[PDB]
Amino acid sequence: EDPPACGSIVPRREWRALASECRERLTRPVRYVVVSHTAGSHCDTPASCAQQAQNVQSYHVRNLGWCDVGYNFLIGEDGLVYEGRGWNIKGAHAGPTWNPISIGISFMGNYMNRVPPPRALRAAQNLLACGVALGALRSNYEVKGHRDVQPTLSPGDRLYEIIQTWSHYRA
Amino acid sequence: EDPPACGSIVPRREWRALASECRERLTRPVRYVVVSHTAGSHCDTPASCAQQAQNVQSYHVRNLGWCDVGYNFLIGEDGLVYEGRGWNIKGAHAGPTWNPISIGISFMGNYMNRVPPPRALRAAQNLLACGVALGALRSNYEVKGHRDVQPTLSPGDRLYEIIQTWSHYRA
Amino acid sequence: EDPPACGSIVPRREWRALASECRERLTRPVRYVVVSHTAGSHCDTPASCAQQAQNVQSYHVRNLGWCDVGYNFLIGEDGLVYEGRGWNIKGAHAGPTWNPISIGISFMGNYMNRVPPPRALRAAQNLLACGVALGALRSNYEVKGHRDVQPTLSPGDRLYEIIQTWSHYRA
Amino acid sequence: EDPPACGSIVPRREWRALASECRERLTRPVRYVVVSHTAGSHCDTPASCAQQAQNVQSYHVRNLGWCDVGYNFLIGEDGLVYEGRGWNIKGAHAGPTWNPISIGISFMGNYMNRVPPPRALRAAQNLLACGVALGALRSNYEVKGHRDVQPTLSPGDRLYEIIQTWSHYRA
Predict the structure, then answer these.
(1) Whole-angstrom Cα distance, residue D83 to residue D69?
(2) Strands D137-145 and D30-37
(3) Which of A137, B67, C83, D6 is the most buried (most CB within 10 A)?
(4) Chain B partners of D135 at a C-beta cutoff of 8 Å?
(5) Structural domain tally of chain C?
(6) In A, residues 48-107, which contact C (CB 8 Å cutoff)?
(7) Residue of D74, D107, D46, D127 lying closest to C80 (CA atoms)
């Protein structure tokens, strides 16, 4: 069980997230990853991305009344990964059939007419390899675009175009 | 008076829907109505709008594997309401919490920077008044925009903006 | 903050409850409700049920040494709700994870082989709407079986099966 | 279904009620509430009280030829409310003047020399509060006694006396 400190993941406390009230768990190893975009604005710096993650959480917790931000992880264009509900807590990002069997990661921004920068993508891929290293994800895990399991424009055309070219993508 | 007196809808056969396989049912009268937009292209004729309703339905059934198009009713810019799951079948448009206690109506098109023409709006409000008359909806029913209960841009800024003005809208 | 009082709860002074030595409070609005059964004797008259409440309180206090009867509320088969620690005080019924973020209501009886009467079910369902109306429970509160947050049979197979039908239920 | 009667009312069916033949609706918002005692036998358990509601209905239907039991609601010493004609139907409880303008709630038993239980008092308020919530009782509703409007002794001296101590009551 060789140890990799692959957590180039910014903790909840570090981006000053509100405390979570979610308690239901994901049984590891999880088989799926559903990729979405927030459809909101992007951020290209730890400082702005921290705030942007606060806003997304805000919307979900204050406006929608949820126990925590809906994603397990969020990707910023600053090239960092933000801890959402994490590897062990069931997200609220792709429905009742998919949330309990998937890890939901969301790129912060709107990708209908923009590609996320290479470092945002490297962070996403690095985050999945990590999940595999830890046994949080099956080594043969499958990636889905949010539009493949729920009716939505998410994760955006350009971004959707890209994940389809991904090794673990299966529609 | 009686027996009926309510707004008109294009029936499933008329638009050429595949047969529904959905079985789960809503309890009447329903307290909530959720307004979304399909987020795709719009249609301003009975011909293109039926075609449109086909597509949306194809995506939900052929691609997401659902028993039927997600919405209870669709609204075209042609001025006609399109039968979806109807007043009795639980739809799949606003998630596990609202699907079983609401009627999901979705305008066909994207209303982020565009508003639906007056006739599409009359159709939608006609429909709600129809639903009330049928006892399918409570007389003190409430309207929510899709974004008020799910993380999404739906029903679109301009549309969402419009429904905030409605007699039955409740944030 | 929300003027009108609610439901028909038999207050403490009426079922002759020992004073409470509990002080740790709950952050309102509470998100979860965990349904349990006492697994003790059932009662179907105000007098026998007032007694049973007393029995349950006393056993938690005198024998287990708890600051007050562990449940936030108790339900009789006489169809009445019995005030336990109430809405503002943290209770001891579902473990350290859940006790600070939930409301615990217990049906006085054993429900492995008996279903409680409709009036008991009704009293519970109505106690919850009160909780919301009062602002003690979130409008989108979630009900969980005792067994879905702990290893146990509680609230009993029959009662468990029932609450799985309630609209605010989440496994 | 999913919405049960507010304030834990025992449904017509639970107390084994004969079907109603009444058609005369009252148009809520009703302005008044009249309190009578049935002058019949009292009961303090859910079992005995269901028989009494059945007793009183039978008397009114089989013997007086009425379309249903006189009252809109009956209160029990068990602390439960019993559905009579409900909110919508005009009841026969206080003559040709007040039957069309008020809601008749009747305490089961003779209360000339008996003061009824506080739980039954709580259930009564509970009934009136949930009446407003429904749109049946005008939010600013008013209360009168049976003897305040007819040559009768009902609701009984002890019972009548406390009804005056009320808030919503109008002299």
Answers:
(1) 10
(2) parallel
(3) A137
(4) 140
(5) 1
(6) 65, 67
(7) D46
